[PDB]
Structure formats: structure tokens, C-alpha cells
Amino acid sequence: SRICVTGAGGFVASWVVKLFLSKGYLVHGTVRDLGEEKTAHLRKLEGAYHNLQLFKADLLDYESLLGAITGCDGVLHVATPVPSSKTAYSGTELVKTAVNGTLNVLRACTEAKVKKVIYVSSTAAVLVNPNLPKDKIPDEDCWTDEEYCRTTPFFLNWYCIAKTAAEKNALEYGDKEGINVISICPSYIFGPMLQPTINSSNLELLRLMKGDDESIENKFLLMVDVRDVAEAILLLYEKQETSGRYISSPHGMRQSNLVEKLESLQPGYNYHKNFVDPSWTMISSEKLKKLGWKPRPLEDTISETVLCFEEHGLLE
Amino acid sequence: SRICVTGAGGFVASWVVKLFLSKGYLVHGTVRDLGEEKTAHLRKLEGAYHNLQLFKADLLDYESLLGAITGCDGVLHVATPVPSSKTAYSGTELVKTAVNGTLNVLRACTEAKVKKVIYVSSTAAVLVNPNLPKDKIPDEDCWTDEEYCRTTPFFLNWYCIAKTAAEKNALEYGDKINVISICPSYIFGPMLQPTINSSNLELLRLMKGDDESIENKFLLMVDVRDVAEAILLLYEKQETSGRYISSPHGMRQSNLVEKLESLQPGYNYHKNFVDPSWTMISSEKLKKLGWKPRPLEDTISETVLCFEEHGLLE
Ligand SMILES: NC(=O)c1ccc[n+]([C@@H]2O[C@H](COP(=O)([O-])OP(=O)(O)OC[C@H]3O[C@@H](n4cnc5c(N)ncnc54)[C@H](OP(=O)(O)O)[C@@H]3O)[C@@H](O)[C@H]2O)c1
Numbered sequence A: 001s002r003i004c005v006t007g008a009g010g011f012v013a014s015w016v017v018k019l020f021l022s023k024g025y026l027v028h029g030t031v032r033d034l035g036e037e038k039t040a041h042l043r044k045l046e047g048a049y050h051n052l053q054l055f056k057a058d059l060l061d062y063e064s065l066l067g068a069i070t071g072c073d074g075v076l077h078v079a080t081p082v083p084s085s086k087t088a089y090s091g092t093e094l095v096k097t098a099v100n101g102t103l104n105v106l107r108a109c110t111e112a113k114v115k116k117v118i119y120v121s122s123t124a125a126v127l128v129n130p131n132l133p134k135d136k137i138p139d140e141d142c143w144t145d146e147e148y149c150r151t152t153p154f155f156l157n158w159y160c161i162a163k164t165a166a167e168k169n170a171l172e173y174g175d176k177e178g179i180n181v182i183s184i185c186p187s188y189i190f191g192p193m194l195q196p197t198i199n200s201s202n203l204e205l206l207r208l209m210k211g212d213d214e215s216i217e218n219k220f221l222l223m224v225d226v227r228d229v230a231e232a233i234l235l236l237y238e239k240q241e242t243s244g245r246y247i248s249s250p251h252g253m254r255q256s257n258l259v260e261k262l263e264s265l266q267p268g269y270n271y272h273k274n275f276v277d278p279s280w281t282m283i284s285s286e287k288l289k290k291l292g293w294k295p296r297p298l299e300d301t302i303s304e305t306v307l308c309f310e311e312h313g314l315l316e
Numbered sequence B: 001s002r003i004c005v006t007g008a009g010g011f012v013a014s015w016v017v018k019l020f021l022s023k024g025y026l027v028h029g030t031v032r033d034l035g036e037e038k039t040a041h042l043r044k045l046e047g048a049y050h051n052l053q054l055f056k057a058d059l060l061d062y063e064s065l066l067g068a069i070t071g072c073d074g075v076l077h078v079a080t081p082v083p084s085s086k087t088a089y090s091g092t093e094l095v096k097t098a099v100n101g102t103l104n105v106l107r108a109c110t111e112a113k114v115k116k117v118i119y120v121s122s123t124a125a126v127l128v129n130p131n132l133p134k135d136k137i138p139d140e141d142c143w144t145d146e147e148y149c150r151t152t153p154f155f156l157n158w159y160c161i162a163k164t165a166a167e168k169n170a171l172e173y174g175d176k177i178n179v180i181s182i183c184p185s186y187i188f189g190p191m192l193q194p195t196i197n198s199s200n201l202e203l204l205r206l207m208k209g210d211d212e213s214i215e216n217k218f219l220l221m222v223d224v225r226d227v228a229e230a231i232l233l234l235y236e237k238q239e240t241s242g243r244y245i246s247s248p249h250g251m252r253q254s255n256l257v258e259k260l261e262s263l264q265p266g267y268n269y270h271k272n273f274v275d276p277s278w279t280m281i282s283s284e285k286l287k288k289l290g291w292k293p294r295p296l297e298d299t300i301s302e303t304v305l306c307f308e309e310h311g312l313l314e
């Protein structure tokens, strides 16, 4: 049986693809460039030579996606750009990429008569809501206030607007017949990298390791291992009696405390040590855990990320 | 006297034919490919040079079966696909293969005037019943609820529907022609064929330890060599009929891993699991005819030995 994976060369999508290959699936992975160095890390995957088929598609090109999707039993829409802190993005076109790419993907699956789709969203589509009270522990029923991100300026405002809009489009599309559409919304994703380039979430983790002197927000990070996300996606695809959103955010700490456990597990780096100073920080991943999902302890995720960092020569 | 054997290149069928050749029989073996690569392990069995006669037949091609079967005193229908877990199968076509292939074999047998047939079924056609109570020790008269298997999702559910329906159809047709059925458990043992089958695949699964926590299934077990000699015993004996359960042993996968570690150390056995009363089905109907299976520990240690020599643990 064949499943499609959008952006197979991405941080998350590479582990998704590696895992699905290990389980006997036939993968159709889409990439925007088939050059050997971009796709090297995907070709090397065990089982890939015979059961991995990479296409050159773009989310805004309906035809290329149709070609990559035709004949697939499922498809895992993972492809959405994730802006870096050390850069600027155009909200207009990120919103355009996310929503229109999603619409195209969904149209292609209705055409190819795909049975199940799994859209990878984010907690950014759940938590950013100022009206939801404090005695409320947010879950899969809480949505992000599009009004609020459109009103108030903060980095990743447009990212959140794009993620919520794309996830509402996908979920709502799922209530026809013959088409079950799931959504998974992880929080900040950390873990060892398969791709040669470092992604955004891992870069802000790396930022905390190369100390500086600027005064950062002591934000509360909620975190999940990328390998756990992949196995969650496996679990949600294979089990039939699934429907709706599923939050995957097992761990959560202040940046203060994350630096100190990192310092405790991985000494030998001048970690950043200059912060200053809620509720929602405790969303229940239980809808997932009730299916058997068992995340790994944060220490291993942390230690395996730092050593892949070192292997990539990012620490000198 | 001549006997036919369907899918002679299979895991069980290979042992069936080697044994029958060991006993002076002339065996007509069915395969779907006559290439020397897939038939090599059969050509080498002593007696095959003079007394093995291989035909190219498919269970859904009636005349292929007719050709391989005509002229044989007995038939041993053992050809039925059994899916491996790390792939996917089409239950629709599997169960269609099993039942229609079984029907085709039986029609060919009454056309060729064969006198005895032995169908190889499974405990999957006996145990999977939610209606049967826990106080009841299941035997040869408890059938599987096929609706339940088609309602409940689990890998090998369609396989269970196949074996039950095929075994139902076979013995129904036998009242037309002596038709015996043997229902074995999970089959382990040394392999004669070059490619590993599915049951031995999941034993190799239990041997290569990991971190994922698998189901602590209760496996009922029988040796492939014991299945072969049971089939021989059932065919040679003239006072045999009906179903015969062949499942002498049964253990939890965790206890199974430790008896394996106990007999074969030096391997990173799987050791994280999770979490009955159908576990004591009586093989007495067979054992009363002289069938004496071997202890499970021989079967497993010899199976892992062949795993070793086939280079499957690196
Ligand atoms: N990383 C996190 O912390 C986090 C947290 C929550 C949710 N998520 C979600 O996880 C998913 C994967 O993101 P990631 O973590 O793996 O970071 P990433 O590596 O930057 O993912 C970017 C992927 O999207 C592809 N892409 C971008 N624009 C495309 C387009 N127009 N057409 C086709 N592909 C396009 C990229 O293809 P190329 O390889 O050609 O560049 C790349 O494969 C995203 O949907 C994200 O919202 C991530």
C-alpha cells in the first residue's frame, strides 16, 4: 500500500518517511528539487531504493501534486514553511502557500480517491487565544483567535494565521464521505536531524547553547521529539477509529530550566544565561496517549539533538 | 501409489514432500514457477530425482490443478498464502484464493476420482469466536465467527475468514470422497525453502530486540516437522476423518523469549511487552492415533539454528 508525503526532505518529513519505509509502506515523497545533495539523505534510507519514489512537485502547482498522489491509499500533508527567528518572511505568501497548497492537496486526493489524509498543524493553531479563561486547560477543542493574531503584532503571527486557516480548511473538508481527514498539532519540535540543513526550531534550541548577552524572554516552551511525532503519525494513520485533532506536546519548561537541564546533561557549551521572569503550559496530549502513543523522556531527545548538532559542526 | 501436494515449495509443503519421498511415495508437486532457483531445495531431497514430478499449477486455474492431480490416489492441499506482517495483503483476494482454490482442488479430485484429500487449515478457523465462553475448552467442533473477524480489525482477520470459510467449504463438499482437515497452531521449525516465511519471520522479530512495546500475545505452537508427520499419519491411517487439532504447546511471548534465551543465549532478545483460557485446546484426537509431537524447545532451538546458518542475525 502506498502513501504520499509532502516535502519529504523536510525535518519532520524525513523521519516520517524513514519510519514508514521501515514498516513496509511504499512512499511517494514530493520535493521541490531532485538534486542529489538535497535528496541524498532520503535515498540512503533503508528500504528507500525499492519503495521510495520521489517526485518534483510544488504545493501551488495542482498538476504536479496530482501526479505524485495518484494511486496512493493515504497522504501525509507535512509541507508548510516554518520561519526562522534570524530572518524575515512574507506573511502574505506564507498564508498563500499554506492554505492554497492545502486546498490543492485536498482536491488531488478527492480526484485520486484517497481514503485518509493527515494534516500536520501546530499548537500555534490551538493556544493563541486571549479570550479563553485561565481556569481552562486547553485541549483539541480550543482554536486560535484569527482576530487576535491579525490585530496584535508578534513574531509568528502570520504563521499562526496560516496554520489555523489551513487546519480549519482540512478538518472541514473531512466531513464528506469516503474521506477521513485527521489533524495533528505538535508544539516546538526538537530532535536529531536527517536533512543536511538545520531547521528553525532546532536553530532556536541551538541559539540557547551559544550564549550571548542580550536579554531574552524566559518563554515557556512546550516540546516534542520529532521521532515521537513520526510514530504518532504512524499510529494515527494505521488506526481507523480516528477523527479530529490530536495534540502532541508531552513536555514543557521555562527556557531558564531548559538551559539548566541541558547544562546538566550536556556540559561543555557557554549556554545563554540572561532571561527575565502561566497556565495553558499544560495541554493534555491524552487523546493521543489513549491510542498507545508513548513519548520518550526529554533527556534523550535533548542529548541526541546536541550530538547531531556536533556532527553537523554547528558548535565551534 | 501417487499423491499430489499443492504449493510444494512452501514452508510446510517442503517438509511434507521430503517426508513422503522418504516413504517411497510418488508425489506430484504443484508450484507457480518452475525456475531452478525456487525448486532447488526440492530437487535435492533424496527420492526427488526419480519420484518427484513437478507441475506448474495455480489454484485459480482449474485445469492446471486437474493436470497435476489426475492419476494420484491422494491429495494434500496445503497451498494457501499466509501474509507476512511487515507488508500488506488484500484480504478480498486472499480469502478468494483460499476458498476458490480449495473448491477447484476438490472438483478436480472428484473428477480424477481421488480417494482421500487432506486440507491444511489453521486454529484461526477454530478459536476466533467471541460467542464461545471461557469455561469451554474448544475442540474440533467450535468454529470461528467470521462476522466477528470482519467486524473487528486486526492483522490476519481476513486470513482467519479465509481459513474458516475454506475449511467450512471443504468438509461440506466431503459429503459428496473422504476429506480430512488438520488445524495447526502457529508453525515454527527449520526451513527448507530459501526465503523465510511469516511465522518464522515473527520469531526472528522476537529475536531482534528493540524499544517498541509489542503485544504479549499468547502463541500456540507446533513444529513444522511434526505437522508433516501428522499429515503422513492422517493419510496412512484409514480410520481417520473430520478435523484434527495439532497444537501441542502454548506460551506467552515473554515466557517464550526467556525459554529461547535459556536454550539459545548470545542474542539481544526483545524484552518489553504489555498485559487467557482458550490456551488448552486438546490435541488428543491426533495423539490417540499415535501422533507424538516433539517438545517445543527442540523446535525453537533448531529454528534459531537455521536462522543462524541462513545469516538472518547480523
Ligand atoms: N519544527 C517545529 O517546531 C514545528 C512545530 C509545529 C508544527 N510544525 C509543522 O511541521 C511541518 C514540517 O515542518 P518542519 O518542522 O519539518 O520544518 P522544515 O524543514 O522547514 O519544513 C519545510 C518543508 O516544507 C517544504 N516546502 C516549503 N514550501 C513548499 C512548497 N511551496 N511546495 C512544496 N514544499 C514546500 C519544503 O520543501 P524543500 O525541502 O524543497 O525546502 C520542506 O520540505 C510544518 O507543517 C510545521 O507547521 C513544525
Ligand SMILES: NC(=O)c1ccc[n+]([C@@H]2O[C@H](COP(=O)([O-])OP(=O)(O)OC[C@H]3O[C@@H](n4cnc5c(N)ncnc54)[C@H](OP(=O)(O)O)[C@@H]3O)[C@@H](O)[C@H]2O)c1
Residues within 6 Å of the ligand: B006, B007, B008, B009, B010, B011, B012, B013, B031, B032, B033, B057, B058, B059, B060, B078, B079, B080, B081, B082, B097, B120, B121, B122, B123, B163, B184, B185, B186, B187, B188, B197, B198, B199
Ligand atoms: N506458516 C504458519 O505458521 C501456518 C500456520 C497455520 C496454518 N498454516 C497453513 O500452511 C499452509 C502453508 O503456509 P506456509 O506456512 O507454508 O507459508 P508459505 O510458504 O508462504 O506458503 C504459501 C504457499 O502457498 C502457494 N500459493 C499462494 N497462492 C497460490 C496460488 N494462487 N496458487 C498456487 N499456490 C499459491 C505458494 O506458492 P509459491 O511457493 O509459488 O509462492 C506457497 O507455496 C497454509 O495453508 C496455511 O494456512 C500455516
